[PDB]
């Protein structure tokens, strides 16, 4: 109401307030709050939480990991891939789906980004603002086709790309 009053909007005709139930996709929100007072332990728990969260929907649905820095997006994507390979859970995202698997394998080979080609063979992917436009568009194109199982990117993708 204060914003409507600041904008000179009548509360009866111009006022429209839709709650969270009005969202087209009702999203189950999970909050992971680290309680440890050690910075090193908190960082380790966050990586485990991301790996645990990725494993909850490994082969079920795509995962859109949000990072803060461009280098962290690659480190986080490789961190999840390294944990998946260590636990032998790398094949959950990429099943016997050679149609999708061959496209990722074929697209990873033609990709010029060395960091993206390391995770291109698996379901992992990276989408940062420092990447090339052609490489960034392939990640958006690959993610929109249900090819990239886990997508890691900064906050720029959420605002510049309408890829849910």
């Amino acid at each position: 109401e204060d914003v409507a009053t600041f904008l000179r909007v009548d509360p009866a005709k111009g006022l429209f307030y839709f709650d969270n139930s009005f969202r087209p996709v009702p999203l189950e929100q999970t909050y992971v709050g680290i309680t440890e007072k050690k910075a090193i332990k908190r960082f380790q728990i966050m990586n485990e939480i991301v790996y645990e969260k990725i494993m909850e929907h490994a082969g079920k649905n795509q995962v859109l990991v949000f990072v803060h820095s461009r280098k962290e997006t690659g480190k986080t994507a490789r961190a999840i891939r390294d944990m998946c390979l260590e636990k032998d859970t790398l094949g959950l995202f990429l099943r016997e789906g050679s149609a999708s698997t061959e496209v990722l394998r074929t697209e990873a080979e033609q990709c010029k980004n060395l960091e993206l080609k390391d995770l291109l063979p698996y379901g992992f992917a990276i989408h940062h603002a420092g990447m090339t436009r052609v490489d960034r568009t392939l990640v958006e194109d690959l993610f929109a086709d249900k090819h990239i199982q886990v997508l890691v990117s900064t906050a720029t993708l959420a605002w510049g790309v309408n890829l849910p």
């Binding site: 005709k13 111009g14 429209f16 839709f18 709650d19 969270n20 139930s21 009005f22 969202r23 087209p24 009702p26 999203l27 189950e28 929100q29 999970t30 909050y31 992971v32 709050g33 680290i34 309680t35 440890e36 332990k41 728990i45 939480i49």
Partner: protein, 82 residues
């Protein structure tokens, strides 16, 4: 400087935060997991429906390319925006 908010965009004016009914939380190991279940959509009104693009004025029909109908929020504010 005293009247300003030091947090900036993270300043919270509310002391209490009320969550939904099925919003239980528990601390598993070193972290507290608070899950908010997906809220069920509000039931459609008896005299409210998603109007299609054929009901809006013909001037705005060209802009709505590829959309047969409108969203629930868009349909409820169609007369207040055009």
């Amino acid at each position: 400087e005293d009247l300003v908010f030091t947090q900036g965009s993270h300043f919270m004016a509310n002391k209490r935060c009320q969550l939904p009914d099925g919003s239980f939380r528990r601390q598993r190991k070193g972290y507290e997991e608070v899950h908010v279940p997906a809220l069920k959509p509000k039931p459609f009104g008896s005299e409210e429906q998603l109007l299609p693009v054929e009901k809006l004025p013909k001037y705005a029909q060209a802009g709505f390319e590829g959309f047969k109908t409108l969203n629930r929020i868009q349909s409820k504010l169609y007369r207040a925006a055009l």
